[PDB]
């Protein structure tokens, strides 16, 4: 699936991410735009033998198990497949988890490079949340 700005905007909100530990909904809708094009399926390998997965592109190192990475430390106990799904429960849940360690959203590059400190309200304007 490929979400429509507003779509995702709301489903996030429904997944309790609006102000999830300090970060306005905008930051989510944004970080997924730039980081996966709102495409649950997106996948991009990290030269480093790792792989990315889904909407917030969770990594194959410290977050899920692809069985193609050995260092592999599944902080999120989820089989990466689970992140490719139509259902972002998986993805959110682990996000809710990453974002809990002082690097918060800095864990997300696109967010750090192109999202971060922009009027993010943007991302959630025009929507029917």
């Amino acid at each position, epitope marked *: 699936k490929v979400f429509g700005r507003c779509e995702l905007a709301a489903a996030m909100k*429904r997944h309790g991410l*609006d*102000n*999830y530990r300090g970060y306005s909904l905008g930051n989510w809708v944004c970080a997924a735009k730039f980081e996966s094009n709102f495409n649950t399926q997106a996948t991009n390998r990290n030269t480093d033998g790792s792989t990315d997965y889904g909407i917030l592109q969770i990594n194959s190192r410290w977050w899920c198990n692809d069985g193609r990475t050995p260092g592999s430390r599944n902080l999120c106990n989820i089989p990466c497949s689970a992140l490719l799904s139509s259902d972002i429960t998986a993805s959110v849940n682990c996000a*809710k988890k990453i974002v809990s*360690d002082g690097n918060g959203m800095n864990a997300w590059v696109a967010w750090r490079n192109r999202c971060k400190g922009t009027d993010v309200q943007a991302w959630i304007r025009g929507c029917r949340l």
Partner: antibody
Amino acid sequence: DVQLQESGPSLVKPSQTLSLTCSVTGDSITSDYWSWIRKFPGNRLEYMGYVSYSGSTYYNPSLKSRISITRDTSKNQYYLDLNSVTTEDTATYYCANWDGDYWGQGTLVTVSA
Amino acid sequence: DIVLTQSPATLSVTPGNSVSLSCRASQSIGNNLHWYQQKSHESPRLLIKYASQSISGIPSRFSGSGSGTDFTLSINSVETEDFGMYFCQQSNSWPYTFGGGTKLEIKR
């Protein structure tokens, strides 16, 4: 599978310092986010703070700045260190992991003169 | 910090009846309210995550719902093995705060 077993003293003098530990065995510690939670006499639970991958720490303001959670990766365990102990600090301290997927027996701790 | 108000205090219920515990957070804390169970002589256990996300290996009798302020967990067709206490915990904001608890008693 994964087992966490808190250890330390039974009692320390007020305004002394209590140090506990939570040897984690079986599963790895390398980064899973761990915590400390206390259950007081009135049966109400209170979260102390936690240790997230990195060495990012957060701590319940309720608990002044008397705390200092920390870990030892070679020795797979992590500790707890409540400084300037006091009466109220009398409760049972437990160690968890992020959510509370896993827990430990708990260990009773008295702060009496 | 942020409070959660667990109502009712106690509940004495008759094996096979349906009950329901509430937990009101004084904040929007949308969706991150999780329930644990602490059965006499032990360390809690997680029942339901986020709000309605049931943990695995827990009875189908347990059901949770809500988001916003008003949050509830329902025990359907109670069982004698359901005597214990139930607390709620938000993880939306720091510090993570627990609820007053609710001692569900089994009518013998």
